């Protein structure tokens, strides 16, 4: 197979040709993007566990000189709050929104979703809330007022990478 450093006339930049080999297998990998050094983005499917508490996600190990980064993005969601299980990538259970007596009623209408994350001691602490129409939820509890706190009725993709 072999390999070599070629050069194209279009511009003034060199290139290391590895396309003769079918796969390049590395351990750690970094590359540059407009002067910044990055590692590849790595993705995980995430949900919150029962109980309305923050979701902890271990931070990836970064090469020397690079800092941990994180982004969470919405995949599926509903206004069911705790009354849900979104932990399967292929099916969702969404029962409905808790009513003032504690029963599961229809799904409420939605006003927003917040996803928040902070890095503490090589752990990302992720929190979320879903805002819903008022007048439905109990006065107190995980799902109360107009807010579904750290809801089960949410799946997000967590992206991590390292960057200078």
């Amino acid at each position: 197979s072999c390999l070599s450093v070629r050069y194209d006339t279009v511009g003034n930049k060199t290139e290391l040709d590895l396309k003769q080999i079918d796969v390049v297998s590395a351990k750690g990998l970094s590359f540059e993007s407009d002067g910044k050094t990055k590692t590849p983005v790595v993705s995980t499917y995430e949900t919150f566990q029962d109980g309305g508490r923050a979701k902890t996600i271990n931070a990836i190990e970064c090469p020397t000189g690079l800092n941990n980064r994180f982004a969470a993005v919405v995949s599926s969601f509903s206004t069911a709050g705790q009354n849900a299980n979104f932990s399967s990538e292929s099916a969702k259970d969404s029962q409905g929104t808790t009513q003032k007596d504690g029963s599961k009623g229809p799904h409420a209408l939605l006003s927003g979703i917040s996803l928040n994350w902070t890095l503490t001691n090589k752990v990302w602490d992720v929190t979320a809330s879903i805002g819903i129409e008022s007048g439905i939820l109990p006065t107190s509890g995980i799902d109360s007022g107009s807010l579904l706190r750290n809801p089960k009725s949410l799946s997000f993709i967590a992206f991590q990478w390292c960057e200078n």
Copy 2:
């Protein structure tokens, strides 16, 4: 240009320096992230075709030993259901929600979005539903009850990668 294997005192890890060359060009590529072997995430903009059926997406070819992975994430959405075309990245057509007579009325209010995916014979079968306020849609059809099935009024980014 040339290249070499350097070593930094910060820690106890080696490094293959290729930064003297402007571009490294590979065919297949894998790297490690906290002990797991991955290939780079690759992204495609996706919408459903007319008719309320599942969206099939071919699975990428994976190196030996690695398994196919997938994640879909929300980009744009509305409650128009079938009455939409979101297939352009630069503009959206969203006409409104089907009413009980079959006409296009105002956009209904939303209670959730589900995105689901399953791998079958090197094809990802993607399905989606948007939940809306009740009392608007016809009793039967693709958009019926409180659900917009496999809606046109949705764009998602499909991420694929391989992993052990």
Copy 3:
């Protein structure tokens, strides 16, 4: 440490082993995915500035022969429109929806989110709108009718990469 080109019997493909070195450090990097040439996806957290105007994002520099690509995906959102600041990854300010007199009232209910992007002279021009229940907003302004234009009450992840 050293390195070499190995070959596995599973199939008929070669492999360049770099796993003896702890990190592979490149400048530009491209790889192939099912015949297409790509660069790694790179992610940035984004919000709109005050005033309801488009969000300009510089396009990354691409290797020779490759074209710029972009995808925006939803992270957090609400119906507050201009009455918000989502620019922190760890906390959100969302005050409420503008009412007909100009005051900040409760958050309105939502019918959709559009994220649009166009490439002009190595700049991505990103626009967004959030559709809300009618009868709430003033008749004119950035947030008017049933639309919140280029809203502050939105964070998105911008992904860029290059592709043939």
